[PDB]
Design a protein around this ligand. Structure first.
Ligand SMILES: CC(C)CCC[C@@H](C)[C@H]1CC[C@H]2[C@@H]3CC=C4C[C@@H](OC(=O)CCC(=O)O)CC[C@]4(C)[C@H]3CC[C@]12C
Ligand SMILES: CC(C)CCC[C@@H](C)[C@H]1CC[C@H]2[C@@H]3CC=C4C[C@@H](OC(=O)CCC(=O)O)CC[C@]4(C)[C@H]3CC[C@]12C
Ligand SMILES: CC(C)CCC[C@@H](C)[C@H]1CC[C@H]2[C@@H]3CC=C4C[C@@H](OC(=O)CCC(=O)O)CC[C@]4(C)[C@H]3CC[C@]12C
Ligand SMILES: CC(C)CCC[C@@H](C)[C@H]1CC[C@H]2[C@@H]3CC=C4C[C@@H](OC(=O)CCC(=O)O)CC[C@]4(C)[C@H]3CC[C@]12C
Ligand SMILES: CC(C)CCC[C@@H](C)[C@H]1CC[C@H]2[C@@H]3CC=C4C[C@@H](OC(=O)CCC(=O)O)CC[C@]4(C)[C@H]3CC[C@]12C
Ligand SMILES: CC(C)CCC[C@@H](C)[C@H]1CC[C@H]2[C@@H]3CC=C4C[C@@H](OC(=O)CCC(=O)O)CC[C@]4(C)[C@H]3CC[C@]12C
Ligand SMILES: CC(C)CCC[C@@H](C)[C@H]1CC[C@H]2[C@@H]3CC=C4C[C@@H](OC(=O)CCC(=O)O)CC[C@]4(C)[C@H]3CC[C@]12C
Ligand SMILES: CC(C)CCC[C@@H](C)[C@H]1CC[C@H]2[C@@H]3CC=C4C[C@@H](OC(=O)CCC(=O)O)CC[C@]4(C)[C@H]3CC[C@]12C
Ligand SMILES: CCC1(c2ccccc2)C(=O)NCNC1=O
Lengths: 614, 309
């Protein structure tokens, strides 16, 4: 079915003729689809297809166990897929790629609506390749840790020159990323070519505020392991190394974003004049320059087709609400340059943008070890809050309409009616009661008060019942909902936060040097280098040497038979299997020792008969 | 012995540091209050913020009571989670405050009163004050004639609606959840910490003089005086060598008993019993396999011997 789906997608027959001997080339095409991304399968490189077509020594692919890992996963052969995984090489890649293929065949089989046991068991198999990856990673941490860094950030040339980290994030394989090896690996990418690690964060801000403090910072050693993309004077290179580090470029965008905030709350409080103020010109710059940066992230995405690149951009929930508010501030900018009444409108359009850029600080605060989970807390709580609000909305209108009828019996059709339905009871659940308007005295000398509109002896009751249902009942529930979901939301959304550390890293490493106000100069170098070399790759890898290749393999197979050794040995010395073994042996002891005494019955009569014979 | 290390050891207890700060502020208040008016009233102001501190220090005095102490430690632990809450409260409060000031008062010159206007009413909305008159002030009608409505002034009810919903219903309930999910762990930590800090109280009040602070100048001048003329004029038991030998003997009994007691718990633990039974029974199979083969040979020999007779 997979062949049918993507051969018809690429090569535009019917139900595919079953005589079609599916080429290894077409098997290459199904791997690329189930990966997504820019994974170019070894089958679909031009050398493998020219060697295929010239044939239709090199028939024996150099690493046969890798092509049999795919052969097996594509055939849902789980016992052989674990079989091929033990005897082999690059097993961290093999299990992480197979976790990605499994999950991928799982949503495909539900998409075509095949047999539901296929989609069900493909989730479990995707978990099965999953835990063997992270248990093998845990045991590589048990041995020499520095070798295990070079195992993951190895360039996986057979698996489309990737990284085990690049593969695991695409697999959404959370507990790989949250493991201690990969966390302090991502910390190594974060500090960049620096060392510090002692109440850091402060002296990197002090490096930006005071440029001469860059000299005193202990920068990272001359070789170390510089994780890098597609591959007097020392003071100037140390200027460069600080101003290319991802934690540096983050805090330097953060001082630029606080800095923008301090200018876009000032222009909205103070009166704007006909020509924009110098403060507001800095504002108008920062949004548009950041718009060029936002469209650059779309343009330099990993997929090829532009609609697919836009789809990956749409996955980043925050980055799309940047674009909506850049466009929203642009509409308010046009109205601001116009005269009355559009001028007064453009200030209010600016006022609506005030809220969003305040909310855009929450994610920025999401970098911190504790505020980061806390922002993720609030997002899971509001699915529960929406439910709370719908039950709010039934009961609030309950009092809102039933009072508008009684208090104001004779009113014409007007939209003012629906305002007074929602206005007053909704401001009650936050503390107010509107005390004078609860039960105003009526029809009594005071001046005889206006007549009691008949039914006004009930609107105190239905409000009192409304206050107990709103302020007490539901509020206590949303407490009880929140308290009994915080346990699961905390433990998941810590590991979610460790998963989004990866994404943050890759983004700020691609983000240019200069801040969003000054990013036009790093943009114009990017456009100029693009155009002059037109007239004349994402990831952080090491591209290590060939002699170090075999060594990182040899470490890894010693991890393979190590893990398979105590997996067997934990079970030969698990408690419940000792009881099993003893219940067998004894069982053999019962029939055998039945035989011994019953055969020495013959020997006891044999000695007694020889006694008569002697 | 070094003065800086003395300052570090005295910096360890934070309550003592805040004592020194507040004593310094009360001295500053004495300076200004015994200085001429207008500096008099500022001295009385400084006396008020000192009253605030000395009042709080009663919580440090409320430590001996075995329940109240870990409650004080509970509110100290919940400080950090309130900080989290406080940072986000700011973000959301500052959001509605700046938006409200940018709509309800459009034409305003720069002044620091704007900051007070932003932080004024939004903050007291948390504690039950909706400011009901200024929620949607009626405008543009006639009753006199009402002043004109600002452009898009119906935003302010809606944004204050969402801010009140996020503040009172989400965030306060979430801090309820935060304090309620961290209560148990903070019980265990804090009652252990109160029993630990009881020692520091024990030894401090042992070294503390007899006379109370209003009269402690007497005991201090006596002690300084007697030490400087005595230039010319822990609570260890200091137990003698006999009992010292008995406490070594006692300790050797406890050491031997615990080591062989964890050995007896190690053997009598059921995984020890099962492990033994397993290796033993395996040796049994090896022995009885030898027994059965040797018995077959012996029965053949007995058959041959009976064939002889
Ligand atoms: C003054 C008034 C207007 C208050 C404004 C209320 C909303 C505009 C804010 C309040 C809390 C915010 C949320 C706080 C935390 C998160 C989690 C986080 O969510 C995600 O990254 C997407 C995942 C998801 O859907 O939960 C960032 C956005 C979100 C939903 C925020 C979206 C905007 C919210 C709902
Ligand atoms: C179910 C609960 C949790 C949420 C329901 C609350 C909202 C749906 C309601 C409550 C108060 C309402 C507001 C009350 C008053 C106004 C002013 C109104 O503007 C005017 O009447 C013009 C100004 C004037 O006439 O003085 C526009 C609608 C609005 C913002 C209302 C919009 C809808 C709001 C926010
Ligand atoms: C169970 C819940 C979800 C139902 C809630 C429905 C009501 C709250 C709404 C639905 C349709 C609304 C009506 C739709 C249209 C109008 C016309 C509108 O007329 C004007 O504003 C001016 C009329 C004119 O030009 O003369 C007055 C409000 C009114 C009656 C609305 C009042 C409120 C209504 C009844
Ligand atoms: C489920 C949760 C998220 C809330 C549901 C949203 C609705 C209940 C809100 C959203 C927009 C609101 C409307 C926004 C604006 C107006 C115009 C407003 O008209 C006036 O105030 C007329 C002026 C006057 O009072 O003279 C009456 C309320 C109404 C219909 C609001 C009624 C309630 C609405 C439909
Ligand atoms: C927490 C539990 C125990 C609820 C307790 C609340 C009730 C015992 C009280 C609270 C407010 C009272 C209401 C307040 C006002 C009125 C109006 C009253 O009508 C009149 O006095 C005639 C005309 C008028 O002035 O409204 C009839 C009773 C009623 C509904 C009252 C009925 C009893 C209520 C619901
Ligand atoms: C009327 C208003 C102005 C009162 C202001 C409140 C704060 C000044 C108080 C209230 C509760 C106090 C806390 C209550 C409990 C503790 C634990 C306790 O900690 C210790 O004894 C360890 C070292 C130390 O901090 O003294 C004293 C500090 C602390 C955090 C207190 C710090 C000061 C707090 C936050
Ligand atoms: C991210 C958070 C911290 C945003 C907080 C913003 C406000 C706290 C700041 C931003 C710009 C500040 C304004 C910048 C300049 C001035 C002019 C200044 O004018 C004077 O000092 C002359 C007369 C006087 O003393 O008021 C008064 C304070 C004010 C309005 C400032 C008030 C406080 C503002 C609004
Ligand atoms: C951990 C929490 C407490 C962080 C909060 C810190 C800031 C948000 C607060 C702390 C002290 C506040 C300041 C205290 C006093 C003033 C003076 C005040 O001046 C006026 O109102 C001018 C007089 C007039 O009304 O004309 C303006 C707000 C401002 C700057 C406040 C702005 C907000 C500040 C900096
Ligand atoms: C608009 C927010 C931000 C940002 C995001 C995270 C940290 C710092 C700044 C920016 O100001 N410029 C680059 N892209 C962005 O989304």
């Amino acid at each position: 079915h997979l062949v049918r789906d993507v051969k018809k997608r690429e090569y535009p027959k019917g139900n595919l003729p079953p005589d079609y001997r599916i080429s290894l080339i077409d098997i290459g095409l199904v791997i690329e689809y189930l990966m997504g991304g820019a994974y170019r399968c070894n089958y679909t490189r031009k050398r493998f297809r020219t060697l295929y077509h010239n044939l239709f020594e090199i028939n024996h692919f150099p690493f046969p166990f890798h092509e049999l890992m795919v052969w097996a996963v594509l055939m849902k052969r789980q016992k052989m897929a674990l079989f091929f995984w033990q005897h082999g090489e690059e097993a961290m890649a093999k299990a992480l790629v197979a976790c990605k293929l499994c999950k991928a065949m799982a949503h495909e089989a539900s998409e075509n609506d095949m047999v539901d046991d296929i989609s069900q068991e493909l989730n479990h198999n995707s978990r099965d390749f999953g835990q063997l990856a992270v248990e093998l990673l845990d045991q590589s941490y048990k041995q020499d840790e520095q070798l295990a860094m070079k195992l993951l950030t190895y360039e996986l040339k057979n698996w489309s020159n990737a990284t085990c980290l690049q593969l695991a994030v695409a697999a959404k394989h959370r507990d790989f990323i949250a493991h201690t090896c990969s966390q302090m690996l991502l910390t190594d990418m974060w500090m960049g070519r620096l060392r510090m690690r002692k109440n850091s964060g402060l002296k990197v801000i002090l490096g930006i505020l005071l440029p001469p403090s860059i000299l005193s910072l202990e920068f990272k050693n001359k070789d170390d392991m510089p994780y890098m993309t597609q591959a007097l004077i020392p003071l100037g290179r140390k200027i460069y190394e600080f101003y290319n580090a991802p934690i540096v470029k983050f805090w330097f965008y953060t001082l630029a974003y606080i800095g923008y905030l301090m200018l876009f709350n000032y222009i909205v409080l103070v009166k704007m004049e006909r020509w924009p103020s110098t403060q507001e010109w800095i504002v108008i710059s920062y949004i548009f320059t950041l718009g060029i940066e936002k469209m650059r992230e779309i343009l330099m995405s990993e997929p090829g087709k532009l609609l697919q690149k836009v789809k990956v951009w749409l996955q980043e929930y925050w980055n799309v609400t940047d674009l909506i508010a850049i466009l929203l501030f642009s509409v308010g900018m046009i109205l601001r340059l116009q005269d009355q009444p559009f001028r007064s409108d453009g200030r209010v359009i600016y006022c609506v943008n005030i809220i969003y850029w305040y909310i855009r600080l929450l994610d920025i605060f999401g970098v911190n070890k504790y505020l980061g989970p806390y922002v993720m807390m609030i997002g899971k709580m509001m699915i529960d809050m929406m439910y709370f609000v719908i039950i709010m909305l039934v009961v609030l209108m309950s009092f809102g309409v039933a009072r508008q009828a009684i208090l104001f019996p004779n009113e014409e059709p007007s939209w003012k009616l629906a305002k007074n339905i929602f206005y007053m009871p909704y401001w009650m659940i936050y503390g107010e009661v509107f005390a004078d308007q609860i039960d105003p005295p009526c029809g009594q000398n005071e001046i005889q008060l206006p007549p009691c509109k008949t039914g006004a002896w009930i609107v105190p009751a239905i409000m009192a019942c409304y206050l107990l249902v709103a302020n007490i009942l539901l509020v206590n529930l949303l407490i009880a909902v929140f308290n009994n979901t915080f346990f699961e939301v905390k433990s998941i959304s810590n590991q979610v936060w460790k998963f989004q550390r990866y994404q943050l890293i890759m983004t700020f490493h691609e983000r240019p040097v200069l801040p969003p106000p000054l990013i036009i100069f790093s943009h114009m170098t990017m456009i100029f280098q693009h155009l002059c070399c037109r007239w004349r790759d994402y990831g952080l890898k090491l591209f290590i040497t060939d002699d170090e290749l075999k060594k990182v393999h040899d470490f890894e197979e010693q991890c393979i038979e190590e893990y398979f050794r105590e997996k067997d040995d934990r079970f030969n010395s698990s408690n419940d299997e000792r009881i099993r073994v003893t219940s067998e042996r004894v069982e053999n002891m019962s029939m055998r020792l039945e035989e011994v005494n019953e055969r020495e019955h013959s020997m006891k009569a044999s000695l007694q008969t020889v006694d008569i014979r002697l």
